[PDB]
Amino acid sequence: RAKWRKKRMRRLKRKRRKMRQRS
Amino acid sequence: VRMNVLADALKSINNAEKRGKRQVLIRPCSKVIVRFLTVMMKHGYIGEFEIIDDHRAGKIVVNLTGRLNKCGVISPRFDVQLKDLEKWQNNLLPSRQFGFIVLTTSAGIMDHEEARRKHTGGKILGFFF
Amino acid sequence: SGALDVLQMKEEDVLKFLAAGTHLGGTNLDFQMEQYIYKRKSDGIYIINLKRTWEKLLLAARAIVAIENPADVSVISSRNTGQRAVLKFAAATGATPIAGRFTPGTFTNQIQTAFREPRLLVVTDPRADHQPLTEASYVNLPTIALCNTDSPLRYVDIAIPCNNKGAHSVGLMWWMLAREVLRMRGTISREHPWEVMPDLYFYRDPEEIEKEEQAAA
Amino acid sequence: GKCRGLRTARKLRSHRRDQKWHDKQYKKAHLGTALKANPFGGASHAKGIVLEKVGVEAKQPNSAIRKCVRV
Amino acid sequence: KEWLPVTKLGRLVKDMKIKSLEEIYLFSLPIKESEIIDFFLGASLKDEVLKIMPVQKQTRAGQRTRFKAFVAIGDYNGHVGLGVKCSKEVATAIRGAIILAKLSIVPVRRGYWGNKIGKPHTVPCKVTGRCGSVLVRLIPAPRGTGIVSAPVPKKLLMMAGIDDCYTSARGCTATLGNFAKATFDAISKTYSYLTPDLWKETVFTKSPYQEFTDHLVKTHT
Amino acid sequence: TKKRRNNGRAKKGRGHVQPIRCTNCARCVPKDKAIKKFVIRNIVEAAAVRDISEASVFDAYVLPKLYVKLHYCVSCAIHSKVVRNRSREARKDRTPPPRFR
Amino acid sequence: MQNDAGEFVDLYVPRKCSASNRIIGAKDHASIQMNVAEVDKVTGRFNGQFKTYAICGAIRRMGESDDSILRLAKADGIVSKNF
Amino acid sequence: GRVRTKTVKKAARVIIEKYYTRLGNDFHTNKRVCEEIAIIPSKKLRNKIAGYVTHLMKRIQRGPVRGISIKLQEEERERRDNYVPEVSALDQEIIEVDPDTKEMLKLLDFGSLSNLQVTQPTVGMNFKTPRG
RNA sequence: GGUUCGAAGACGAUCAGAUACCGUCGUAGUUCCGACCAUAAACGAUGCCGACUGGCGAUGCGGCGGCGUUAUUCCCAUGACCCGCCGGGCAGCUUCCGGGAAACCAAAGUCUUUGGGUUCCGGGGGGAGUAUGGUUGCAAAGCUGAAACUUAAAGGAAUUGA
RNA sequence: CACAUGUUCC
């Protein structure tokens, strides 16, 4: 189901934005 | 709303020519429209018409024959010179055997074949074949 | 036909339509016959004009005698109400009958035994005889259909408004048509009425066949 | 098109200017990012120096061992 | 070889009472017999098998395939037609496309372009044909140009003798089945499109069924 | 691929209506989409109609009746074997079955 | 269809429908000629001449066949002008 | 537990059509009639057709049969299709004639008739079936 | 303020595994008010205005006239039915109008017989609604929005088997 | 009340 194909990318973006502030 | 007076006139009579009616009712009558069909009077494409000349937008009732398959309207009114009167008929008219491009000029609303004679083109209206 | 001194609407025909129930129509209306209807009477019944019945009978009777050979004219009645009238017209006029249970493919299959090429088609009503009208668009065949106030006019060339439901009203139609087509061709005169009664073409229910036989014995 | 006036020319080719970018052929020939990424750099032939040899496994049913070279 | 007549118009062929096949297409009576075209214009009627194509049907037990042949027919004078047959063998599918190709010949209109001197070389007017998604147009051409068209519709256009042709197409022309029959509607539209030369009202000749109805009941059933 | 003119619903000018709950399940269906069986039910079918008559109060006492408007969903109506799948030529026939028995 | 010099070059002239005033195609399989017999003004019997008509197949497939031929026969005097 | 198939029914019907006069009513009476009029391959097939031959006359003795062509029944149908009733019910002295049918006759050539009866108009013109 | 129901979570059964479907609870929520966000298969997967083109049976608004029935019985006049019609309001059946690739559609028609007017939006499938930039929001997140690279396919309609 | 999966090319 394509609904959680989008939600998988959404968890990647929160992880990728958190490492922006760490630097 | 109502943008054109001549485009709806030709679309209404083409919607009934494919059906096969003999008398139809067109809502507008303009100065261009009343002398637009007089070109078809000299070419014999449509039967004689009677109008209701009143204090409103008059209603024209035209006799319908089968000689005019479709009269075409072009929008807007492009400018046509005599360096390109042969240019459109390559894409617009069926042939020179028949098919007519009508134009409105300083001489009046008139055909491309006679536009070659009086040497005056210009503002265009449409085509009937 | 048109303003002909020999062919007005006749007094002796007046009493036949009024007693039969021909001028009465149906509850509904088909959009085609605006010109064939005079007025609406009480309880939802339309009125079929007798002048229109006379004129459209003549144009129907024009085409019957115009085909000089009656051997290749077909007649159809799939409804049991017009069964008795049309069968003996094949023997009388010379036509070829189609009396119920019509086979599809009689006009396109060259292998079938009943492969026909007539000139004129006779329909009692378009709804029960819609299938014969299908092949009329594939091979060029004129047709007559006895139309009601509700019968469709699809693939019907010549149509006559009358009542195709009552038993006494249907057999009047082919009798008067037979009485007319005999008059244009040089066989029977016009001043004297036809000797054969119109009752010969009324379809009779089998209930009355065994009941009238009781009165004989 | 959809608008059919007589003096709509700025409405016309500006509504043809920007989806020319959505066409791949116009975008490829007018955006230089792939021209930077072109390892020929606008060329057709290029010299090269080998550092190793790489054997590439082939695709679906049509399968073999392909002779490829690191350049 | 010895033909046994079936159709009513078929008997009229052998009686030497009709001069040509033009009077049949005057009245547009349908044709079901395939020797009538051979009888009148079967001299230069040239056959050509376009293509073979193994169309297939999926069944429960095994597979099931039958062939299909395409044929353009005519002489090089005004008369061409198309034939379609899907049969089991390539021999029967080819003849089936040959044998029905007579049955669907449509006479084309050749007209002049500008001056009316010489022989009618092009289409009288701009006409098109509609079937499927493939579009084709018959566009008049200047003198001495030729059939400027795709090779498969190019063959069917010099197949009728019309020489100067201009075209303009749209659609998946790779489906030449939908592309050849698109020309078929366009060439058939010429005798349905009203011409200002043909504003003269047609006097109605009497039908051959009506003219010879006495003979139609004395030599057969 | 589109299957119906009105896709299982009788909404043509509303856009939004009030949902209702189902009967066999608690499926939440809009009111003009669920199947509304207004089932008529006598209290005793065949057994006690003779049995009440020998213990009733008055002469030919009339029995009361139940009127419950069932609201089955798409999945609950087919599981109760009420509605049936139909051919596309017979899907448009929306006339109710008769009441012969 | 005639040339520059004045010779009829067309191989036939197609029919015309008298109702819609348009020509009839070569593969129109529903177009019908209405054969109308002639009635004598004093005898009433068949003469030997016809007032032929034509109808196209498209008019048949909408249903306006009989209304046209009634109008067609009014102009030729077959239908009574009093009506 | 017995059904007559297409082979039995095509052999039995054509025998009855052409050889009506030679068949009897008992099974064994016309069983040997079928022996001489056709070439029957086996004993079993002759008894199979002849039972259905006798089965159809019980349908004939009941009345007319749809799928049969009998000359005598054809003449008897011609005798009843050309039957002549008494005088016509089209020409009466009493005829019901609605109020709205007069003015179409009144504006026609024959306005005043002799053997007609003007009827009352039905008061209350409700004629349609209730909806649902 | 929490009646009922019910994310998360817990407990009892099935499972080889349930962190699921079933049942017992139960927090945020579900109810109201004031501040936020602007996403939905927000669908009629079908923008808005306007001329025309099959009928047919309906329903709703307002208006016109009319046998008659029923109440204010005490009629003029009002109501409720019945008959039609008028402008449009959601609509429905039929279909060789016509269109479309077809499913289907009186519009998805008046389209190679190509132009009534106008807005938004797509250019093979992925990468990707992603990086970056800007911007709104407390946050979740929303709007705008790539590229390198990868692929000969991705996809829609329809027939027959399974 | 359960039923999960059948290694690739043809």
Numbering used by the authors:
A (entry chain AL41): 2 to 24
B (entry chain AS22): 2 to 130
C (entry chain AS00): 2 to 218
D (entry chain AS23): 2 to 72
E (entry chain AS02): 58 to 278
F (entry chain AS26): 2 to 102
G (entry chain AS21): 1 to 83
H (entry chain AS17): 2 to 133
From the paper:
Toxic dipeptide-repeat (DPR) proteins are produced from expanded G4C2 repeats in the C9ORF72 gene, the most common genetic cause of amyotrophic lateral sclerosis (ALS) and frontotemporal dementia (FTD). Two DPR proteins, poly-PR and poly-GR, repress cellular translation but the molecular mechanism remains unknown. High-resolution cryogenic electron microscopy (cryo-EM) reveals that poly-PR and poly-GR block the polypeptide tunnel of the ribosome, extending into the peptidyl-transferase center (PTC). Our results demonstrate that strong and specific binding of poly-PR and poly-GR in the ribosomal tunnel blocks translation, revealing the structural basis of their toxicity in C9ORF72-ALS/FTD.
The structure of the polypeptide tunnel, where poly-PR binds, is nearly fully conserved between yeast and mammals. Indeed, our 3.1-Å resolution cryo-EM structure of the rabbit 80S•tRNA•PR20 complex, confirms that poly-PR binds similarly in the mammalian and yeast ribosomes. Poly-PR density is strongest in the tunnel constriction near A3908 of 28S rRNA. From here, poly-PR reaches into the PTC and either competes with P-site tRNA or packs on the ribose of the 3′ terminal nucleotide of deacylated tRNA. Poly-PR is incompatible with aminoacylated or peptidyl P-tRNA, suggesting that the DPR protein would compete with both the initiating and elongating tRNA substrates. We found that PR20 starts to inhibit peptidyl transfer at ~100 nM, comparable to or exceeding that of PTC-binding small-molecule inhibitors of mammalian translation, such as harringtonine and nagilactone C57. Indeed, toe-printing of polysome fractions shows that ribosomes accumulate at the start codon in the presence of PR20 and harringtonine, but ribosomes accumulate within the open reading frame in the presence of GR20, cycloheximide, and GDPCP. These data indicate that PR20 functions as both a translation initiation and elongation inhibitor, whereas GR20 predominantly inhibits elongation.
